[PDB]
Design a protein around this ligand. Structure first.
Ligand SMILES: [Zn+2]
Ligand SMILES: [Zn+2]
Lengths: 80, 124, 48, 240, 59, 187
């Protein structure tokens, strides 16, 4: 229901940066879109923004697993 | 619109011996459907039955149906003369018909995503 | 495909490999072929 | 269509039960008796001498010369009314005492009118239910026979039982209605009939007033009817 | 046989059915660039029909 | 995938819907009013096989005969694209093998929207005709009167962008004749 405390695969503490990563990510996407209605922002276009440098700025390594689970984990607070 | 004839077999008076059969005829006048309701057990009216309440209590999410009718009968004698009677029935709760979830007859039609989420329904 | 089509594609010739990706007509023909094998495998239990 | 050559018609419905009538009698009851007109009701022409039309008249001419055990004395009959009379002789379930209602005049007309109106509504009801639509019901039934003989002809394939140009998907509303009514038949009007039966069996009808009509109507619709109807409707939905 | 009544209606309607196979071949009657090809029967008889009424095999 | 249930429980495709029942009476009273239809009681079987008239069914029942079945079916198809005279969910089938027209507006018809392809076949045909006129008359450069054939859909990238932006709907595409609903009968 949230980004996990640790990476499911290796156990790196990805959760200690999860909250920040969420909020920062949102702001970052609002920079790349240019002030659009939340529905007029298509879902497929919000996912094509590269989050590589943002995750690196969080101090997270270049591990495939950690970034997979950080980027793709669904938050329940946005579905209910 | 039912219309049939049945042979009568009452043989006590002379006036009974003057008759042949009874012509049955009747129809229904006004039909309407209201939302599902519940009793709450206080000797009162019917209160709204929410879907989760029916899920939990093992009830049925059925709304009562209201019908009106007209019953007009004919009486046939031996000679060939007839006696016609008429009767009017006001709106009358016939039975409860099941209600589909999310339809016009459902309570979660006037209720939005927040309202569905608040009472114990799936908002999506 | 039009009526009385003479091209080989109209009757189930697939020019694409799986790694290249089939098209809609080729996927349908391959779906027709695959469904036959499932049905015959369903007759495997009952008939014998 | 049979191996011998007879072309027959069965009308499955509530009133009747799987009776098969040769393809000429249905046409003759409706006012079209001449054989040339009837062969123009299926082949649509008598002046085209091609393979299809020659073989069509061959099959249909051979069809009308078979002796069905049920329609022997009504095989070459000339008019409509006595054909309908024999129809009543056959299908009338409540008539089991022949040679008696024929001694009077009114019963013949009553049976003829009843069998005229039922077959006016029970045959091809999508074309109408009044007498003015009977004539074109003849033409449409002829067209159906023609289409069937074209498949006998090996000219067109039979109907594909799996293509979706001849399928429909109904769903909740239609099935719920047709089950709300199929069980309405047993638990409502039959109880009303029986309640009126037992009200007439006890209380004098010339003494019966409106109050007792209301009493009997609300008695025949007591909790047994409402219970049985809804229980059978839910049992039908859950049983499959 | 065929081409005569088993498919006469279909053949006459062929130049108008949009789902029929067209052939890049000139027409003699109306000098049209394309014709409609139909392959009927188990002998696979080929007929080139045109909207102008042209028909091969003397039709 | 296993057992006797294979091929028994089917699933709708992503764009497939099921049609409700349309107003059959409006279309029927429109058809009987159409001058290009001879009424069923106003024509006989001999007439319809002599001239070869084509019969017009609506929702199952036969309601007259037309002279040119293809022309009637395509004119009603063109009316269905305007959306005012014929309802967009009307099935208009034309059996060219037996030469009959069928209109359907009942319940249970699977439909899906399909983008409509147009072309300039009429301009191509007149160009071919004038090229033939110059061909037999003796012009050595007759073939520069011919025009290329063009077939295309009217769906543009801007319409896709607006669908993603929510400013365009399917009912707006049907309304301006870009897509139309097709049934397995009409397909
Ligand atoms: Zn990891
Ligand atoms: Zn031509």
């Amino acid at each position: 229901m949230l980004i996990p405390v640790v990476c499911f695969t290796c156990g790196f503490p990805i959760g200690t940066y999860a909250a920040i990563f969420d909020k920062a990510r949102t702001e970052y996407i609002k920079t790349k879109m240019g002030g659009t209605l939340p529905q007029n922002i298509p879902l497929d276009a919000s996912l094509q923004i590269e989050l590589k440098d943002l995750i690196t700025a969080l101090g997270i390594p270049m591990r495939v697993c950690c970034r997979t689970h950080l980027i793709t984990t669904l938050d329940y607070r946005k579905y209910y | 619109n039912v219309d049939i004839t049945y042979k009568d077999q009452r043989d006590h008076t002379e006036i009974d011996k003057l008759r042949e059969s009874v012509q049955i005829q009747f129809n229904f006048t006004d039909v309407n459907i209201e939302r599902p309701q519940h009793r709450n057990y206080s000797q009162g009216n019917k209160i709204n039955l929410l879907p989760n309440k029916a899920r939990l209590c093992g009830l049925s999410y059925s709304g009562p149906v209201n019908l009106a009718a007209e019953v007009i009968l004919t009486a046939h004698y031996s000679n060939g003369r007839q006696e016609v009677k008429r009767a009017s029935i006001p709106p009358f709760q016939v039975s409860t018909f099941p209600i589909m979830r999310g339809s016009n007859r459902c309570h979660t039609h006037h209720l939005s995503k927040t309202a569905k989420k608040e009472i114990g329904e799936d908002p999506n | 495909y039009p009526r009385f089509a003479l091209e080989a594609q109209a009757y189930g010739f697939i020019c694409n490999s799986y790694i290249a990706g089939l098209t809609s007509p080729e996927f349908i023909f391959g779906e027709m072929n695959g469904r036959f094998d499932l049905i015959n495998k369903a007759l495997s239990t009952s008939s014998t | 269509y049979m191996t011998t050559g007879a072309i027959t018609i069965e009308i499955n419905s509530t009133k009747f039960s799987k009776l098969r009538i040769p393809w000429y009698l249905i046409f003759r009851m409706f006012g079209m008796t001449g054989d040339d007109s009837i062969i123009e009701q299926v082949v649509f022409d008598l002046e085209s001498n091609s393979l299809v039309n020659t073989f069509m008249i061959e099959i249909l001419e051979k069809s009308i010369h078979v002796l069905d055990p049920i329609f022997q004395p009504v095989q070459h009959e000339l008019n409509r009314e006595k054909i309908i009379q024999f129809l009543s002789e056959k299908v009338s379930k409540f008539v089991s005492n022949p040679s008696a209602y024929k001694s009077d005049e009114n019963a013949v007309q009553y049976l003829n009118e009843r069998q005229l109106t039922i077959l006016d509504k029970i045959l091809l009801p999508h074309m109408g239910q009044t007498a003015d639509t009977r004539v074109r019901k003849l033409r449409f039934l002829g067209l159906l026979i023609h289409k069937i003989l074209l498949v006998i002809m090996n000219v067109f394939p039979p109907t594909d039982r799996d293509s979706y140009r001849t399928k429909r998907v109904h769903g909740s509303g239609v099935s719920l209605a047709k089950a709300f009514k199929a069980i309405f038949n047993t638990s409502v009007i039959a109880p009303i009939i029986n309640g009126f039966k037992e009200l007439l069996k006890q209380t004098a009808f010339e003494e019966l007033t409106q109050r007792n009509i209301i009493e009997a109507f609300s008695a025949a619709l007591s909790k047994n009817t409402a219970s049985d109807l809804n229980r059978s409707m839910e049992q039908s939905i859950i049983s499959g | 046989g065929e081409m005569e009544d088993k498919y006469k209606i279909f053949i006459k309607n062929a130049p108008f059915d949009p789902t029929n196979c067209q052939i890049k071949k000139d027409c003699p009657n109306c000098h049209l660039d394309y014709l409609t090809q139909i392959c009927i029967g188990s002998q696979k008889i080929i007929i080139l029909v045109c909207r102008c009424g042209y028909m091969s095999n003397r039709g | 995938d296993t057992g006797e249930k294979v091929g028994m429980s089917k699933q709708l495709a992503i764009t497939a819907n099921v049609c409700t029942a349309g107003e059959v009476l409006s279309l029927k009273q429109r058809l009987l009013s159409d001058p290009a239809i001879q009424q069923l009681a106003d024509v006989s079987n001999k007439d319809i096989v002599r001239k070869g008239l084509a019969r017009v069914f609506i929702n199952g029942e036969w309601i007259g005969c037309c002279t040119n079945a293809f022309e009637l079916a395509q004119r009603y198809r063109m009316l269905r694209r305007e959306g005012k005279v014929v309802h967009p969910h009307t099935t208009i089938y034309w059996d060219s093998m037996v030469d009959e027209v069928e209109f359907w507006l009942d319940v249970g018809r699977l439909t899906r929207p399909l983008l409509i392809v147009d072309n300039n076949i009429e301009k191509y045909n007149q160009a071919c005709y004038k090229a033939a006129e110059a061909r037999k008359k003796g012009d050595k450069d007759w073939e520069k009167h011919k025009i290329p054939f063009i077939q295309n859909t009217r769906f543009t990238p801007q319409m896709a962008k607006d669908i993603l932006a929510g400013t365009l709907t399917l009912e707006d595409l049907v309304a301006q004749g870009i897509c139309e609903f097709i049934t397995p009968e009409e397909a």
